[PDB]
Amino acid sequence: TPSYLPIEKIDITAHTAHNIGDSVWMKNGTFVVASGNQFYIKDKSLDLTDPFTYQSIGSRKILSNDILHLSSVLNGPLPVYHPQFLIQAIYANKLQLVKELLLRLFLALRKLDFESQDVSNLDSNLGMDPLKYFIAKDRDYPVESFPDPYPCFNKTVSLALTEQLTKTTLPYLTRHQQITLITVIEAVDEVTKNENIVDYNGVRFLLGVKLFLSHKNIQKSILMRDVSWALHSDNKEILLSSIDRHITSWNRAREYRIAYWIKEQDLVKKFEDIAKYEFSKDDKRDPSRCAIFYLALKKKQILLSLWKMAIGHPEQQKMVRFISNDFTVPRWRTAALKNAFVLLSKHRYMDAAVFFLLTDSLKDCVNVLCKQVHDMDLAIGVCRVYEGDNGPVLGELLTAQMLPETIKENDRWKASFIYWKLRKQEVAIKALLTAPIDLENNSSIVDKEVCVNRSFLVEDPALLYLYNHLRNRNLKYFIGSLNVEAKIECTLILRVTDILCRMGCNYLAVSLVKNWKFIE
Amino acid sequence: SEYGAIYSVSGPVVIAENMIGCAMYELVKVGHDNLVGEVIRIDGDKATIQVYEETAGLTVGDPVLRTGKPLSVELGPGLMETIYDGIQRPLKAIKEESQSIYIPRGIDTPALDRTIKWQFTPGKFQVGDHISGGDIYGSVFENSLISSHKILLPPRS
């Protein structure tokens, strides 16, 4: 969205051809305009026929029709039920608080309906005590109870809320924001079920994917934020089993970026299943598609059998006669390399990667997968299943193909992931705070002026919440240097606030500054 | 050795003996003038050659040198705006070198001018990248009409 949005076009020209003489705001938004000896004082109300006012107000509902009130709706603290506040209170370790706010929202809506009062009377803070937002830790939250008919947030309250939110239009919320609020209710319902199993980097990932499902129109794969939430979770098995139902095809194992974070011991099984599916696609049986998954696993024999049973395919006779050889033989190794480089010139990139993997030249299979096929997701998967979980070919691939673009794009999620897969944990944790161009002589990769800068560098509060997690688990790497680390923690805390404040979550900014623990 | 001997000569056809270990369509230098010819048939140690020059004066017993290569064409900058002698040798350079109005028998002249400096500019490939046959790894300015002569990797490289 633009940082500024027009809300009125005071068109004095519609009455006189004389140019505006002078313009001056005054008390309560009164905008006095002068021309000749003749003033055009406009009050702070709004004319809904204007295209600017109509577009800025959008679908919202506002108590007063004012430029002052409108400018206090498009900006300023969020109502505590706003979806952008609830997801940000979930990313911060305040899930219990979000559950309580949803319960209070239900109670307030029932109160309004029972008294037949208009919903616009709904309290923005839902009668919450502000100190609740400042509680340092999720398990220290005083989760009080309510009267018997609905004592604590649960499935019944969830369904009642999802009904009410369709039977009423919450104030200040564009209908799309209300849809995302309903999806947040569903996500909290899911988390409450899994809340007893997955640590809280599992809860953040679960909400990330549940929000992804509602935005497949504009979002083509879970952000690297969610991949990094899951990558550092201790319960990757639970997350994978929760999103498994959606991973039927490779195109859906590439949306959830499973190759990045799922455990190698599950990535092997997922390649087996994805090979099964990719073979028996909608069209017909074709061992060409599932070749890479079966070779990466080192199951050339299954691929050979697959080619054999594919009697109808035109390529069958050549491939059965070729693949059956033993590619430890130098002559056949060179023959397979030659065929791989021929297929790279006949524009058959996937087959070139397959052949480059027959001979165990992984460094050439993964470079054909990430550079000519454009699947870094599949390259990482093949690296992780074929050779091992972390490096050595994966390290070179990431440092060559991903690190430069990450530095140019100034992306710190990718940089942290890369320095994690290189098992450079001590600097992988630091890459979350300091920009990639300043890490490990990365300035040698690209000139500092080529990198993105200016307003495009919008912070990401979650990026800090991850650090405070890793920083606390990997203290061994931070005891050696405290003053230098604090010098940048105290900068990124004040730069993460001032976006938590610019995105309306002031209550979370105060919590972040209040509760941050400096490692003395 | 690589030297067979002329056994028979008839018109453009030279049958050479001691040519065991000779490949089909292999170029050969026939005679002392080193006339270029191609082995068209092989029969034991006898290889039949089609000579691409005038065979007048070829003697029985004259050496026939294997070249190990087929009749090849040089492909690269300096190929447009040129006229060639059936085989890939250039007529203008032939005239400039022999300084005569005829085409000397067995004259050897590189097909493409090897003294012209061509303004190479590399393409989209870098070190560590994989290149296969046909990949345009650069271009040179050949002339105002052909302003970018693509430099392709050989088809079998």
PDB file of C-alpha atoms in Angstrom, chain A residues 56-288:
ATOM      1  CA  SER A  56      -9.962   5.663   0.791  1.00  0.00           C
ATOM      2  CA  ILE A  57     -12.898   4.796   3.043  1.00  0.00           C
ATOM      3  CA  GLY A  58     -13.390   1.683   0.937  1.00  0.00           C
ATOM      4  CA  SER A  59     -15.681  -0.877   2.528  1.00  0.00           C
ATOM      5  CA  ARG A  60     -14.994   0.289   6.082  1.00  0.00           C
ATOM      6  CA  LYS A  61     -17.589   1.437   8.595  1.00  0.00           C
ATOM      7  CA  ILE A  62     -16.698   4.570  10.546  1.00  0.00           C
ATOM      8  CA  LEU A  63     -18.430   6.240  13.481  1.00  0.00           C
ATOM      9  CA  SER A  64     -18.121   9.784  12.112  1.00  0.00           C
ATOM     10  CA  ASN A  65     -17.673  10.935   8.526  1.00  0.00           C
ATOM     11  CA  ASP A  66     -14.679  13.189   9.088  1.00  0.00           C
ATOM     12  CA  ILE A  67     -11.239  13.878   7.696  1.00  0.00           C
ATOM     13  CA  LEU A  68      -9.967  13.837  11.274  1.00  0.00           C
ATOM     14  CA  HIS A  69     -11.751  10.605  12.183  1.00  0.00           C
ATOM     15  CA  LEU A  70     -10.978   9.050   8.804  1.00  0.00           C
ATOM     16  CA  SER A  71      -7.319   9.948   9.281  1.00  0.00           C
ATOM     17  CA  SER A  72      -7.666   8.269  12.686  1.00  0.00           C
ATOM     18  CA  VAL A  73      -9.065   5.113  11.051  1.00  0.00           C
ATOM     19  CA  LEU A  74      -6.578   4.759   8.198  1.00  0.00           C
ATOM     20  CA  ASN A  75      -3.874   5.398  10.795  1.00  0.00           C
ATOM     21  CA  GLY A  76      -3.270   5.144  14.515  1.00  0.00           C
ATOM     22  CA  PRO A  77      -3.618   2.278  16.976  1.00  0.00           C
ATOM     23  CA  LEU A  78      -5.437  -0.786  15.723  1.00  0.00           C
ATOM     24  CA  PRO A  79      -8.640  -2.022  17.335  1.00  0.00           C
ATOM     25  CA  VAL A  80      -7.480  -4.983  19.359  1.00  0.00           C
ATOM     26  CA  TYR A  81      -9.583  -7.331  17.200  1.00  0.00           C
ATOM     27  CA  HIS A  82      -7.959  -6.257  13.930  1.00  0.00           C
ATOM     28  CA  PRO A  83      -6.434  -9.265  12.128  1.00  0.00           C
ATOM     29  CA  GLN A  84      -3.133  -7.439  11.610  1.00  0.00           C
ATOM     30  CA  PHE A  85      -3.002  -7.054  15.388  1.00  0.00           C
ATOM     31  CA  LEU A  86      -3.893 -10.661  16.185  1.00  0.00           C
ATOM     32  CA  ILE A  87      -1.359 -12.214  13.831  1.00  0.00           C
ATOM     33  CA  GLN A  88       1.271  -9.848  15.238  1.00  0.00           C
ATOM     34  CA  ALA A  89       0.286 -10.792  18.783  1.00  0.00           C
ATOM     35  CA  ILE A  90       0.639 -14.440  17.752  1.00  0.00           C
ATOM     36  CA  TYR A  91       4.074 -13.912  16.209  1.00  0.00           C
ATOM     37  CA  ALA A  92       4.984 -12.299  19.487  1.00  0.00           C
ATOM     38  CA  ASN A  93       4.724 -14.930  22.191  1.00  0.00           C
ATOM     39  CA  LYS A  94       1.181 -13.884  23.151  1.00  0.00           C
ATOM     40  CA  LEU A  95      -1.118 -16.647  21.919  1.00  0.00           C
ATOM     41  CA  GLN A  96      -3.048 -16.859  25.198  1.00  0.00           C
ATOM     42  CA  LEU A  97      -3.746 -13.143  24.901  1.00  0.00           C
ATOM     43  CA  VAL A  98      -5.130 -13.565  21.387  1.00  0.00           C
ATOM     44  CA  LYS A  99      -7.415 -16.326  22.618  1.00  0.00           C
ATOM     45  CA  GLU A 100      -8.674 -14.080  25.414  1.00  0.00           C
ATOM     46  CA  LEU A 101      -9.269 -11.195  22.997  1.00  0.00           C
ATOM     47  CA  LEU A 102     -11.261 -13.473  20.718  1.00  0.00           C
ATOM     48  CA  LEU A 103     -13.328 -14.625  23.699  1.00  0.00           C
ATOM     49  CA  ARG A 104     -13.968 -11.015  24.708  1.00  0.00           C
ATOM     50  CA  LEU A 105     -14.908 -10.161  21.132  1.00  0.00           C
ATOM     51  CA  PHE A 106     -17.483 -12.945  21.212  1.00  0.00           C
ATOM     52  CA  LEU A 107     -18.845 -11.770  24.554  1.00  0.00           C
ATOM     53  CA  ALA A 108     -19.088  -8.153  23.406  1.00  0.00           C
ATOM     54  CA  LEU A 109     -20.859  -9.140  20.193  1.00  0.00           C
ATOM     55  CA  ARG A 110     -23.341 -11.249  22.170  1.00  0.00           C
ATOM     56  CA  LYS A 111     -23.845  -8.321  24.545  1.00  0.00           C
ATOM     57  CA  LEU A 112     -24.624  -6.010  21.639  1.00  0.00           C
ATOM     58  CA  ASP A 113     -27.040  -8.455  20.012  1.00  0.00           C
ATOM     59  CA  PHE A 114     -28.812  -9.244  23.296  1.00  0.00           C
ATOM     60  CA  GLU A 115     -29.379  -5.551  24.035  1.00  0.00           C
ATOM     61  CA  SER A 116     -30.179  -4.934  20.344  1.00  0.00           C
ATOM     62  CA  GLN A 117     -27.510  -2.227  20.263  1.00  0.00           C
ATOM     63  CA  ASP A 118     -25.694  -1.324  17.061  1.00  0.00           C
ATOM     64  CA  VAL A 119     -22.379  -3.082  16.493  1.00  0.00           C
ATOM     65  CA  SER A 120     -20.619   0.241  15.907  1.00  0.00           C
ATOM     66  CA  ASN A 121     -20.776   0.776  19.676  1.00  0.00           C
ATOM     67  CA  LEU A 122     -18.298  -2.098  20.061  1.00  0.00           C
ATOM     68  CA  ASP A 123     -15.338  -1.147  22.237  1.00  0.00           C
ATOM     69  CA  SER A 124     -12.019  -1.018  20.392  1.00  0.00           C
ATOM     70  CA  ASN A 125     -10.062  -2.481  23.328  1.00  0.00           C
ATOM     71  CA  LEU A 126     -12.815  -4.985  24.188  1.00  0.00           C
ATOM     72  CA  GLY A 127     -12.469  -3.829  27.779  1.00  0.00           C
ATOM     73  CA  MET A 128      -8.932  -5.180  28.055  1.00  0.00           C
ATOM     74  CA  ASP A 129      -6.557  -4.171  30.824  1.00  0.00           C
ATOM     75  CA  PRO A 130      -3.512  -2.795  28.961  1.00  0.00           C
ATOM     76  CA  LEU A 131      -1.018  -4.458  31.314  1.00  0.00           C
ATOM     77  CA  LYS A 132      -2.068  -7.775  29.775  1.00  0.00           C
ATOM     78  CA  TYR A 133      -0.348  -6.819  26.528  1.00  0.00           C
ATOM     79  CA  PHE A 134       2.916  -6.306  28.419  1.00  0.00           C
ATOM     80  CA  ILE A 135       3.232  -9.795  29.912  1.00  0.00           C
ATOM     81  CA  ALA A 136       6.757 -10.988  29.231  1.00  0.00           C
ATOM     82  CA  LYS A 137       6.107 -14.643  28.446  1.00  0.00           C
ATOM     83  CA  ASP A 138       3.195 -16.723  27.195  1.00  0.00           C
ATOM     84  CA  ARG A 139       3.192 -19.177  30.105  1.00  0.00           C
ATOM     85  CA  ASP A 140       3.232 -16.301  32.618  1.00  0.00           C
ATOM     86  CA  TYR A 141      -0.062 -14.854  31.231  1.00  0.00           C
ATOM     87  CA  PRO A 142      -2.858 -14.805  33.885  1.00  0.00           C
ATOM     88  CA  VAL A 143      -5.518 -16.577  31.822  1.00  0.00           C
ATOM     89  CA  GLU A 144      -8.646 -15.653  33.758  1.00  0.00           C
ATOM     90  CA  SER A 145     -12.023 -17.349  33.349  1.00  0.00           C
ATOM     91  CA  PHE A 146     -15.457 -15.977  32.478  1.00  0.00           C
ATOM     92  CA  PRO A 147     -18.997 -16.945  33.519  1.00  0.00           C
ATOM     93  CA  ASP A 148     -20.231 -20.456  32.794  1.00  0.00           C
ATOM     94  CA  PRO A 149     -22.055 -20.118  29.429  1.00  0.00           C
ATOM     95  CA  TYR A 150     -18.724 -19.342  27.716  1.00  0.00           C
ATOM     96  CA  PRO A 151     -15.876 -19.551  30.237  1.00  0.00           C
ATOM     97  CA  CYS A 152     -12.838 -19.950  27.965  1.00  0.00           C
ATOM     98  CA  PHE A 153     -12.137 -19.841  24.246  1.00  0.00           C
ATOM     99  CA  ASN A 154     -12.783 -23.236  22.657  1.00  0.00           C
ATOM    100  CA  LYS A 155     -14.486 -24.893  19.694  1.00  0.00           C
ATOM    101  CA  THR A 156     -17.975 -23.700  20.637  1.00  0.00           C
ATOM    102  CA  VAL A 157     -16.855 -20.080  20.932  1.00  0.00           C
ATOM    103  CA  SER A 158     -14.970 -20.442  17.650  1.00  0.00           C
ATOM    104  CA  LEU A 159     -18.068 -21.555  15.745  1.00  0.00           C
ATOM    105  CA  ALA A 160     -20.220 -18.907  17.411  1.00  0.00           C
ATOM    106  CA  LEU A 161     -17.709 -16.234  16.401  1.00  0.00           C
ATOM    107  CA  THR A 162     -17.509 -17.474  12.832  1.00  0.00           C
ATOM    108  CA  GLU A 163     -21.304 -17.218  12.633  1.00  0.00           C
ATOM    109  CA  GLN A 164     -21.474 -13.773  14.240  1.00  0.00           C
ATOM    110  CA  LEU A 165     -18.752 -12.306  12.027  1.00  0.00           C
ATOM    111  CA  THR A 166     -20.900 -13.214   9.012  1.00  0.00           C
ATOM    112  CA  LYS A 167     -24.083 -11.899  10.642  1.00  0.00           C
ATOM    113  CA  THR A 168     -22.407  -8.556  11.482  1.00  0.00           C
ATOM    114  CA  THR A 169     -19.896  -6.143   9.966  1.00  0.00           C
ATOM    115  CA  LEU A 170     -17.214  -5.130  12.444  1.00  0.00           C
ATOM    116  CA  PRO A 171     -16.387  -1.402  12.486  1.00  0.00           C
ATOM    117  CA  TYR A 172     -13.241   0.001  10.888  1.00  0.00           C
ATOM    118  CA  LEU A 173     -12.585  -3.307   9.125  1.00  0.00           C
ATOM    119  CA  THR A 174     -12.630  -3.660   5.371  1.00  0.00           C
ATOM    120  CA  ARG A 175     -14.493  -6.806   4.396  1.00  0.00           C
ATOM    121  CA  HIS A 176     -11.226  -8.423   3.317  1.00  0.00           C
ATOM    122  CA  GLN A 177      -9.787  -7.729   6.760  1.00  0.00           C
ATOM    123  CA  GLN A 178     -12.857  -9.418   8.222  1.00  0.00           C
ATOM    124  CA  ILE A 179     -12.224 -12.475   6.039  1.00  0.00           C
ATOM    125  CA  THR A 180      -8.657 -12.626   7.321  1.00  0.00           C
ATOM    126  CA  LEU A 181     -10.049 -12.250  10.838  1.00  0.00           C
ATOM    127  CA  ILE A 182     -12.193 -15.339  10.281  1.00  0.00           C
ATOM    128  CA  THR A 183      -9.150 -17.225   9.012  1.00  0.00           C
ATOM    129  CA  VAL A 184      -7.311 -16.083  12.147  1.00  0.00           C
ATOM    130  CA  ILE A 185     -10.124 -17.561  14.238  1.00  0.00           C
ATOM    131  CA  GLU A 186      -9.668 -20.832  12.361  1.00  0.00           C
ATOM    132  CA  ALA A 187      -5.889 -20.681  12.803  1.00  0.00           C
ATOM    133  CA  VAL A 188      -6.246 -20.156  16.549  1.00  0.00           C
ATOM    134  CA  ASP A 189      -8.644 -23.102  16.595  1.00  0.00           C
ATOM    135  CA  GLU A 190      -5.971 -25.239  14.918  1.00  0.00           C
ATOM    136  CA  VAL A 191      -3.209 -23.973  17.207  1.00  0.00           C
ATOM    137  CA  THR A 192      -5.225 -24.689  20.343  1.00  0.00           C
ATOM    138  CA  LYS A 193      -5.415 -28.310  19.202  1.00  0.00           C
ATOM    139  CA  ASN A 194      -1.696 -28.467  18.421  1.00  0.00           C
ATOM    140  CA  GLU A 195      -0.706 -26.036  21.188  1.00  0.00           C
ATOM    141  CA  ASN A 196       0.204 -28.919  23.516  1.00  0.00           C
ATOM    142  CA  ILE A 197       2.638 -30.556  21.067  1.00  0.00           C
ATOM    143  CA  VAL A 198       4.500 -28.039  18.920  1.00  0.00           C
ATOM    144  CA  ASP A 199       6.868 -25.503  20.497  1.00  0.00           C
ATOM    145  CA  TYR A 200       5.983 -21.907  19.608  1.00  0.00           C
ATOM    146  CA  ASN A 201       7.949 -21.804  16.318  1.00  0.00           C
ATOM    147  CA  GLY A 202       5.471 -24.491  15.259  1.00  0.00           C
ATOM    148  CA  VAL A 203       2.537 -22.245  16.133  1.00  0.00           C
ATOM    149  CA  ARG A 204       3.998 -19.381  14.128  1.00  0.00           C
ATOM    150  CA  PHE A 205       4.517 -21.681  11.141  1.00  0.00           C
ATOM    151  CA  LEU A 206       0.991 -23.085  11.430  1.00  0.00           C
ATOM    152  CA  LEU A 207      -0.514 -19.617  11.390  1.00  0.00           C
ATOM    153  CA  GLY A 208       1.784 -18.715   8.505  1.00  0.00           C
ATOM    154  CA  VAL A 209       0.504 -21.559   6.350  1.00  0.00           C
ATOM    155  CA  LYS A 210      -3.117 -21.016   7.377  1.00  0.00           C
ATOM    156  CA  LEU A 211      -2.747 -17.420   6.216  1.00  0.00           C
ATOM    157  CA  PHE A 212      -1.015 -18.590   3.041  1.00  0.00           C
ATOM    158  CA  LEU A 213      -3.981 -20.761   2.089  1.00  0.00           C
ATOM    159  CA  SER A 214      -6.195 -17.654   2.067  1.00  0.00           C
ATOM    160  CA  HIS A 215      -3.842 -15.761  -0.283  1.00  0.00           C
ATOM    161  CA  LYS A 216      -2.879 -18.232  -3.023  1.00  0.00           C
ATOM    162  CA  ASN A 217      -4.190 -15.659  -5.509  1.00  0.00           C
ATOM    163  CA  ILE A 218      -1.379 -13.166  -4.819  1.00  0.00           C
ATOM    164  CA  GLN A 219       1.065 -15.396  -2.923  1.00  0.00           C
ATOM    165  CA  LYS A 220       2.624 -18.290  -4.835  1.00  0.00           C
ATOM    166  CA  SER A 221       4.465 -19.999  -1.954  1.00  0.00           C
ATOM    167  CA  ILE A 222       4.823 -19.630   1.790  1.00  0.00           C
ATOM    168  CA  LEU A 223       7.074 -16.692   2.542  1.00  0.00           C
ATOM    169  CA  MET A 224      10.599 -17.424   3.683  1.00  0.00           C
ATOM    170  CA  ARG A 225       9.396 -16.153   7.054  1.00  0.00           C
ATOM    171  CA  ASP A 226       7.373 -19.336   7.531  1.00  0.00           C
ATOM    172  CA  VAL A 227      10.171 -21.528   6.186  1.00  0.00           C
ATOM    173  CA  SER A 228      12.433 -20.002   8.831  1.00  0.00           C
ATOM    174  CA  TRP A 229       9.828 -20.449  11.566  1.00  0.00           C
ATOM    175  CA  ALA A 230       9.572 -24.142  10.710  1.00  0.00           C
ATOM    176  CA  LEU A 231      13.286 -24.656  10.085  1.00  0.00           C
ATOM    177  CA  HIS A 232      14.096 -23.722  13.698  1.00  0.00           C
ATOM    178  CA  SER A 233      11.221 -25.699  15.225  1.00  0.00           C
ATOM    179  CA  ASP A 234      11.880 -28.805  17.287  1.00  0.00           C
ATOM    180  CA  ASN A 235       8.703 -30.486  15.986  1.00  0.00           C
ATOM    181  CA  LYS A 236       9.121 -30.453  12.208  1.00  0.00           C
ATOM    182  CA  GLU A 237       7.376 -33.834  12.075  1.00  0.00           C
ATOM    183  CA  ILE A 238       4.144 -32.374  13.451  1.00  0.00           C
ATOM    184  CA  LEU A 239       4.204 -29.441  11.029  1.00  0.00           C
ATOM    185  CA  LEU A 240       4.860 -31.752   8.094  1.00  0.00           C
ATOM    186  CA  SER A 241       2.078 -34.115   9.127  1.00  0.00           C
ATOM    187  CA  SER A 242      -0.294 -31.156   9.439  1.00  0.00           C
ATOM    188  CA  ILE A 243       0.456 -29.838   5.939  1.00  0.00           C
ATOM    189  CA  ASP A 244       0.861 -33.303   4.394  1.00  0.00           C
ATOM    190  CA  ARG A 245      -2.688 -33.508   3.048  1.00  0.00           C
ATOM    191  CA  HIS A 246      -1.902 -30.652   0.643  1.00  0.00           C
ATOM    192  CA  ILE A 247       1.373 -32.118  -0.645  1.00  0.00           C
ATOM    193  CA  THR A 248       0.134 -34.343  -3.455  1.00  0.00           C
ATOM    194  CA  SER A 249       2.132 -33.052  -6.429  1.00  0.00           C
ATOM    195  CA  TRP A 250       5.592 -31.561  -6.715  1.00  0.00           C
ATOM    196  CA  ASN A 251       3.999 -28.202  -7.485  1.00  0.00           C
ATOM    197  CA  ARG A 252       2.517 -28.388  -3.976  1.00  0.00           C
ATOM    198  CA  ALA A 253       5.702 -29.640  -2.344  1.00  0.00           C
ATOM    199  CA  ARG A 254       7.219 -26.503  -3.872  1.00  0.00           C
ATOM    200  CA  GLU A 255       4.546 -24.162  -2.512  1.00  0.00           C
ATOM    201  CA  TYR A 256       5.237 -25.191   1.084  1.00  0.00           C
ATOM    202  CA  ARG A 257       8.973 -25.287   0.388  1.00  0.00           C
ATOM    203  CA  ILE A 258       9.237 -28.627   2.152  1.00  0.00           C
ATOM    204  CA  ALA A 259      12.694 -29.230   0.696  1.00  0.00           C
ATOM    205  CA  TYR A 260      14.037 -26.371   2.820  1.00  0.00           C
ATOM    206  CA  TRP A 261      12.949 -27.367   6.312  1.00  0.00           C
ATOM    207  CA  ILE A 262      11.465 -30.866   6.608  1.00  0.00           C
ATOM    208  CA  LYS A 263      13.730 -33.460   8.171  1.00  0.00           C
ATOM    209  CA  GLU A 264      15.852 -35.431   5.729  1.00  0.00           C
ATOM    210  CA  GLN A 265      14.335 -38.620   7.146  1.00  0.00           C
ATOM    211  CA  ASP A 266      10.948 -37.273   6.024  1.00  0.00           C
ATOM    212  CA  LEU A 267      12.260 -35.716   2.823  1.00  0.00           C
ATOM    213  CA  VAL A 268      13.233 -39.189   1.619  1.00  0.00           C
ATOM    214  CA  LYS A 269       9.679 -40.424   2.148  1.00  0.00           C
ATOM    215  CA  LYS A 270       8.247 -37.302   0.534  1.00  0.00           C
ATOM    216  CA  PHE A 271      10.405 -37.808  -2.553  1.00  0.00           C
ATOM    217  CA  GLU A 272       9.210 -41.400  -2.752  1.00  0.00           C
ATOM    218  CA  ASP A 273       5.559 -40.335  -2.534  1.00  0.00           C
ATOM    219  CA  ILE A 274       6.033 -37.391  -4.903  1.00  0.00           C
ATOM    220  CA  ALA A 275       7.690 -39.738  -7.388  1.00  0.00           C
ATOM    221  CA  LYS A 276       4.696 -42.062  -7.135  1.00  0.00           C
ATOM    222  CA  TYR A 277       2.368 -39.151  -7.852  1.00  0.00           C
ATOM    223  CA  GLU A 278       4.426 -37.469 -10.576  1.00  0.00           C
ATOM    224  CA  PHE A 279       4.618 -40.759 -12.448  1.00  0.00           C
ATOM    225  CA  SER A 280       0.872 -41.431 -12.436  1.00  0.00           C
ATOM    226  CA  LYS A 281      -0.059 -37.877 -13.363  1.00  0.00           C
ATOM    227  CA  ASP A 282      -3.416 -37.018 -14.912  1.00  0.00           C
ATOM    228  CA  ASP A 283      -2.102 -37.378 -18.467  1.00  0.00           C
ATOM    229  CA  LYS A 284      -0.447 -40.808 -18.553  1.00  0.00           C
ATOM    230  CA  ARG A 285       2.436 -42.952 -17.348  1.00  0.00           C
ATOM    231  CA  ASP A 286       5.796 -41.344 -18.173  1.00  0.00           C
ATOM    232  CA  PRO A 287       9.033 -42.255 -16.359  1.00  0.00           C
ATOM    233  CA  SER A 288      10.483 -38.964 -17.634  1.00  0.00           C
TER     234      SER A 288
END
